[PDB]
Design a binder for this molecule. Sequence first.
Ligand SMILES: OC[C@H]1O[C@H](O[C@H]2[C@@H](O)[C@H](O)[C@@H](CO)O[C@@H]2O)[C@@H](O)[C@@H](O)[C@@H]1O
Ligand SMILES: [Ca+2]
Length: 472
Amino acid sequence: TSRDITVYPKDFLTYFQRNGSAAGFDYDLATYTQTLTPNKASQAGNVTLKTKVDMSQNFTFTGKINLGDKAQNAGGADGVGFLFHPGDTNVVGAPGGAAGIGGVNGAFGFKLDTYYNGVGENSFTPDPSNFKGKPFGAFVDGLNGQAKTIASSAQSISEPSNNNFVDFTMSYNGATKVMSVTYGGQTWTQDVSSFVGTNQAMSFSIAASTGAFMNLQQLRNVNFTYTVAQGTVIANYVDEQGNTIAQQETTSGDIDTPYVTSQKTIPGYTFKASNGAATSGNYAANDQTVNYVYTRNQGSIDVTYIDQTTGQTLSKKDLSGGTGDSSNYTTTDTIKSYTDAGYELVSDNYPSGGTVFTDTAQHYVVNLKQKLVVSSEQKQVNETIQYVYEDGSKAADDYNAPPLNFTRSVTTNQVTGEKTYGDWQAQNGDSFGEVVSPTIKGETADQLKIDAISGITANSADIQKKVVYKRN
Ligand SMILES: OC[C@H]1O[C@H](O[C@H]2[C@@H](O)[C@H](O)[C@@H](CO)O[C@@H]2O)[C@@H](O)[C@@H](O)[C@@H]1O
Ligand SMILES: [Ca+2]
């Protein structure tokens, strides 16, 4: 790769960032020395690596470490921790009995512990009992956040004395996944594959701390040859309420190397914004996340209710919902409403099996007409001639003349009330005939005939007449 580099003492600070105590002390380019903690109490200072490390590839770390001038008995603490973890390049471990390895998740390393911590805190498990008051060099399991010393790797080291620099070496094999540490003639080896696991990129921190006891702790002549791990970009395709709606898109590539992310076209959904990182840019050591946020596509359906008679809209219902969901609408209720007020349904193009919201808008029409009930009107004009004597007794049988019937058509508007009365039509005619009055022997009728009466109209009043017979 192009990522095989070699950090010289000359360019230490170019790849390493002094943090905590260490920030108050210049890198003396004469001696090639970085103070981590001074001889003061309660200190905490480290160097973090600017990049991460390819744990599929081989690295070698060469330097000298001063652990200080005092042993634990003389008031000397706490040691130098070497931390490897998968998260942030700027995350470092807890001081004290945590050695700069505890209190980080997925953490592992090698410590130089110049103080015996017998007491258990959340950040760290007691130090190996077989090293009470004695200084030791060991591997640490920091994965569950709690730094646990691997008692199998715990050997003794020379007590810090006269601020002397002892030669340190940490080597790693990519495929073996095997760490080889060498501090002044003592040698360690561990297979870290149970720690490195899937993560082939781990951030590198070299920490130092003091407490109630203290010690000047410093690094000199640093030579790190490693393969710099490549940066990641994550792209997440999510709805407005965070739910993932398309498979995310992890992508790795060298640092300061362009990255490009894709606006996905997602059925049912429309791109709103990209929160988080840019959609494009350059790859970096800590990993950047761009989230594409989608709005759930909403469909239209209108159902216009028209009065054909007036050619005027009674009601328009607007429906809106997500593309795929049911409107749960039926015309029947709104139809009924109008049919109660005396409308008649002519047409309904709205599906009886209900609708569903679609990306294309839907338009439906229900046509009603003002109902018209065709009544029949009837009227009869009748003529009666009574034939009586002068005592009012019946002389002859009443003449009921063939009645003149009349028929109209009424049309009642079941909405407005308006009645549309037709043309008064004579079924039998307009003429009431002349009626020659019966001849009674030995009498004379006052009217010997009733004269024919024409122009009878539908509202003409019934003709009533009386023929009186006088004796002789
Ligand atoms: O006094 C504050 C101090 O607390 C911590 O140290 C304790 C322990 O973890 C140390 O090993 C010993 C000797 O150094 O002293 C304490 O008992 C650490 O949190 C330290 O950095 C802090 O300043
Ligand atoms: Ca300790």
